């Protein structure tokens, strides 16, 4: 994928609402500013949230729903020197560009904009929402969050709904905008997405890839992540086994519970191990400030060393042999009076014992 | 069932408490009541989310 | 000593940014049309 | 060495000769002997 | 060179049949025996089993003597080959079967046989009955139920229908054949 | 110009590589030479000796060592260690939210150290702008500037992983005096500095300094009153376990098993190993290992003023030491409430995937140490439901003390139990049991036992 | 020049393999250049080396990308570097890694030069078409809206059997832009954008119905129209 340098993209959670102030007329080759402005939006309804009166710099303002023009190759979009072109949360390739630099504002960072040369990323202090999967909720038409803006900034229990024929990209953009609104909420808000589990998982995967793109473009890390459905099911099983009411315990706090074990016992909690495995299907390593070693799923590892020590570091032949293994297994079977379900494995060792 | 369909939590609670203190509640009446309540609540939880989405639907 | 004035100002803005957006999506006094 | 190459040669020679002359079983050669012959041929 | 994979497959099938570990019944031939022995010879993993079977070429009416380590190695090799569990009794069964096959002469009709020469004194069913019954009477009931009780029949007709659907494509003929031959072969092993 | 012998290269490495203060033991020649080397009075030093020392480092195969035959390596800010950042980020954890780095991005530790990254930022960003120019949007903070998570510079401590994440409190606090090392992201930055002999304007100094090949581990001299000593060589963990078992059985109430936290950094010359043996790093690994069964009578008591230490000072060489029990003896810093380790006996086997769970067959018991780690297990057994053989009993077997319900349907319970030698733990039982007192929620249990229980109970579908 | 290397070959599959490797690794798009004079003489190698420092504004270039674009950024490479493959001679090529810089000069292409898309093994380019391909496992005929195909070492002759008639008791509903090719044969052209945002049209034959009003083919661009004429009108 290639992008034309004439497009400049700014990424900011704030862009869930259109940045009227940031728009500015572009100049032609003759350095003549263009008083005509064209704003592109992903859906027709978006037009209602563009206030033409907020563009004093321009004399004429028009708004249209950006639509993939199959007749134009995005590698070289047509230019329209007669107007300044701005795209808001584009979901399809930009086939048209304005005078000077075509401006783009987006809360999402799809591949289309990923290769865009000029990338301005606004940084925010993270503020995470609460996943509240559960069958007094406040329904929210995700396609039009700004309509529910007041409720989104006031209440704390939202049922996220979508029109049947809503497109996947529209869903992704709506979710991103809602999550930005929550990022600006002082109080985290619980929400439930009225969608099939697989669809929600795919949406979360795409959002994760978008966040990865933002990071690669220089965005600040945010702990406000999301959990795949299998991971949520595992966490729920763990909480139930421990006798923890699901509504009472949040996943984040549940995981944090084992930070007391992480360092002092120099062990990786099994919950974190399982979550990492789920993400991999969709290894671990960490340390402490000034620490000389790293705790990993494999055990202790010298800092900066590979996750596994050289193969010949330790000789296990003494016990890592069929004779010893069979002897131990037979002893166990005899002592316990067992006949099946018994399995003994030699213990290997990483860098350290 | 009616006090569940119609959102009458006071009546539902009254019935639940009366059944708690009526007859051999613990033996099997409690389980039967919980089963009926769970079935009704499952149906209502199936319906209400879609109903709200339809309400806010464009 | 080039402090991260940008980050500080960004956080300060973010504090009331939601209120500003609420103002934008508030009600209007009159319907000119 | 698992293979007694000498005995294997003997059995292989017996069966191959036997078959080098006729076209039948001649039932004092036993499946073993086949196995013996084939293993010899593999090893050599 | 040889198709070690095909050799291994033939060896595995023949070993299963000769160890009565598979109800599956199929034709076998000297080609199959040769496949088996060549695979065993070529495999470093199975040299011990190759040696065991090769010893059958002699009088074969003898009990091989092995160290505990040797026996464990042989059992591990066999268990890895058949992926199961197993027993030195099965080892002896294979030894006897392969000895009978090797000593057998080339023939046109597959020799139907029964199990013989496994595990010296010939015992009658009556003597086994007496001895085993005495030992059983010596034994004490590990567990018991009280009188009466009630057979726990299922009730969910929908569950029964689901199971019926799940089992419909199973041919009763094949299942009966497999079960009967399983019982027959286990009885054969016990007797031998 | 001062010179130095290869025999003193061990002293040079000792002084320049670690954060060592016990320098009184350096002979006079290496003392003066190293003093000038560290204060960067290179004009008073033989550069040929520096090249010889670099070749010595290469010969010992120091990990990440990267360099050429230029004295600018020591005379200027230069990438001295190389390694690739590869972080399997776990977003669900509140890590130290530092500037993001793209996986696979090369990272270079330079000899430069500063007491204030923000001040160096001016000059370093000037160099960065020289390298890239243009109007590239970058992530820049007071501690560095990052381009697309793939290039740039930053300041951190002298020792970071770059493959794991940062979590939890610091067992060591050397930041009190430790300046931040400079790290360079990208072959572009590394090559630029190497070719340009970059060096910040002088106001070594208070503001910043150079510590060539300075890992900065908290090294110190043991100062031990060695009653006795011996050495062994092996790569067989069972041998070390046998030594530990013998020492514990004889008279040792508890052994201090230490492993040096750098034995994997190079093929250290035996002479260098001997020199290091006099010293220890506060951050090295230690384990307070005792024996599960503690003899009741004092007939087994040994000396009350002596300790046994087993130091893995190298990859394959260990030294057993008998020293006088003395407060002044210095030891690696462990966790404030570092859990003790218990040696594994033949009576039971450690459950796979558990650091504190074991099973006794003859007893048919699954036990989980309350706060103690297992140690020495050369073998492990996979968990399986058959282990929890259901106990039969016509009347429910009564239980006392703390009891917790694991599976009411399966009559699975966890019972608090202390081994008569006062070892707290829990017994996982399955069978016809009843509790004298009120059953208790598992949430009451500590995270350690809770994690072990989750591992043991939730099937790994 | 971040880096450079040279190769010699007369086998187009080799060049295609190099391009495929570069695209798969991390390259969003490659600038494949061919010098527009390599057929003028047996240039001495010294002269070739001298010329390598230079380029002709009129030489041939192709902006070649990969049909399938990985969604996640895990495959993203350097954001300030480009890969150029210059066929500076008849048989010698030079691969170059250079810093992404505006000042870099390049041959002048068409103002809206269509991009090229590499051909994967999942489909084959239809003979006589620069933008049409067929996926067997999917049984789909696709025509890129504005993009050229590239790298096709093989081609398949068009044939009616390719347009297997889809059976469906109720007509399969379709959305978006739909066009009628043959009402008698239930042949339609459906606007379709590949999730990676690649515009194109799918030629289908079967029991289909349109949610919206069917649209005249004249609405289509001359590119797709020419391809369709080639594919449909028998070459009697």
Residue numbers in the entry:
A (entry chain L): 1 to 135, 162 to 308, 320 to 390
B (entry chain H): 117 to 174
C (entry chain I): 462 to 494
D (entry chain D): 112 to 155
E (entry chain C): 113 to 196, 200 to 234, 238 to 310
F (entry chain F): 7 to 209, 218 to 475
G (entry chain X): 240 to 475
Provide text from the study.
The most well-studied baculovirus is Autographa californica multiple nucleopolyhedrovirus (AcMNPV). Baculoviruses have their large circular dsDNA genome packaged into an enveloped rod-shaped nucleocapsid. The BV nucleocapsid structure consists of three parts, a central helical sheath containing the viral genome, an apical cap and a basal structure attached to both extremities of the helical sheath. Herein, we report high-resolution cryo-electron microscopy (cryo-EM) structures of the BV nucleocapsid combined with de novo modeling and Alphafold predictions.
The entire basal structure was determined to 5.2 Å resolution (applying a C7 symmetry), delineating two different symmetrical rings: an outer one with C14 symmetry surrounding an inner one with C7 symmetry. The baffling distinction between the two cap complexes is that the anchor-2 rings, which are very similar to each other, interact with innermost components displaying different cyclic symmetries. In the apical cap, anchor-2 connects to the C2 symmetric part of the portal leading to a C14 to C2 mismatch while in the basal structure, it connects to the C7 plug producing a C14 to C7 symmetry mismatch. A major difference between the anchor-2 complexes in the apical and basal structures is the presence of Ac98 in the basal anchor-2, which interacts exclusively with Ac144 from the lowermost Ac101/Ac144 module. The inner part of the basal structure has a C7 symmetry and functions as a plug closing the void created by the peripheric C14 anchor complex.
